[PDB]
Amino acid sequence: EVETFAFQAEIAQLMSLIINTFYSNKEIFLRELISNSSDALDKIRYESLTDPSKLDSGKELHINLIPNKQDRTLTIVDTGIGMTKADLINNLGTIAKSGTKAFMEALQAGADISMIGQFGVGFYSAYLVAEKVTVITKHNDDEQYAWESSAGGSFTVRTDTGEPMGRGTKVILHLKEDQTEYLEERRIKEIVKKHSQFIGYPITLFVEK
Ligand SMILES: CNc1ncnc2[nH]cnc12
């Protein structure tokens, strides 16, 4: 069964902005999503310090980038803490209502879209380059869920029946037709080296057939 939810008004407004503002420096989406994955990895690492059984669902802590030119998707996988159903519904574990307010005021006071991550809502930068985003996640305390939104004011949550993940989060970006440069291995490596050079977890860029 699929449950459909309305976004809180502030988040709908953040998304509509991101989608409809002119802003050429779109590559920052990948920095923000890698940063989110790094934070999720830090969280499960910290919990495992006093309860090593937290890593029974997977001891490897890493980030994988998977381009797929056939489906026009870029997938970011981490083996971090994952999200419960409650986390998903509550704006993917963010304080997005208050963060959106602070971000929109910073914009009028001379901030630009690339500072989105400082306000805790960097996930939504995915919509600079994606027509739809699918999030598959598994937390130790819950089942595997799929979240999906094409913007337009709603999101869906369902129990995921695909391949089990163990623990972590898979963010699947369905790229806009004119944003396929982010499927190119050269372009991805340029962005990672420019913006994510000092992330403290291995980042593997998968190759295509
Ligand atoms: C966006 N919120 C997230 N929460 C937990 N783990 C993640 N991995 C990537 N994004 C997240």
UniProtKB/Swiss-Prot annotation:
Mutagenesis or variant effect for residue 32 to A: Strong ATP-binding. Strong interaction with HSF1, HIF1A, ERBB2, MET, KEAP1 and RHOBTB2. No effect on interaction with TSC1
Cellular compartment(s): Nucleus; Cytoplasm; Melanosome; Cell membrane
Sites where the protein binds ATP: 36, 78, 97, 123
Impact when changing residue 78 to A: Impaired ATP-binding. Strong interaction with HIF1A, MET, KEAP1 and RHOBTB2. Loss of interaction with HSF1 and ERBB2. Los of interaction with TSC1
Post-translational modification: ISGylated. S-nitrosylated; negatively regulates the ATPase activity and the activation of eNOS by HSP90AA1.
Annotated region described as Interaction with NR3C1, given as residue ranges: 1-209
Superkingdom, natural source: Eukaryota
Residues with the N6-acetyllysine modification: 43, 69
Family: Belongs to the heat shock protein 90 family.
Reported function: Molecular chaperone that promotes the maturation, structural maintenance and proper regulation of specific target proteins involved for instance in cell cycle control and signal transduction. Undergoes a functional cycle that is linked to its ATPase activity which is essential for its chaperone activity. This cycle probably induces conformational changes in the client proteins, thereby causing their activation. Interacts dynamically with various co-chaperones that modulate its substrate recognition, ATPase cycle and chaperone function. (Microbial infection) Seems to interfere with N.meningitidis NadA-mediated invasion of human cells. Decreasing HSP90 levels increases adhesion and entry of E.coli expressing NadA into human Chang cells; increasing its levels leads to decreased adhesion and invasion.
Assembly and oligomerization: Homodimer. Identified in NR3C1/GCR steroid receptor-chaperone complexes formed at least by NR3C1, HSP90AA1 and a variety of proteins containing TPR repeats such as FKBP4, FKBP5, PPID, PPP5C or STIP1. Forms a complex containing HSP90AA1, TSC1 and TSC2; TSC1 is required to recruit TCS2 to the complex. The closed form interacts (via the middle domain and TPR repeat-binding motif) with co-chaperone TSC1 (via C-terminus). Interacts with TOM34. Interacts with TERT; the interaction, together with PTGES3, is required for correct assembly and stabilization of the TERT holoenzyme complex. (Microbial infection) Interacts with herpes simplex virus 1 protein US11; this interaction inhibits TBK1-induced interferon production.
Domain-related comment: The TPR repeat-binding motif mediates interaction with TPR repeat-containing proteins like the co-chaperone STUB1.
Protein name in UniProt: Heat shock protein HSP 90-alpha
From-to range in the entire protein, with total length: 16 to 224 of 732
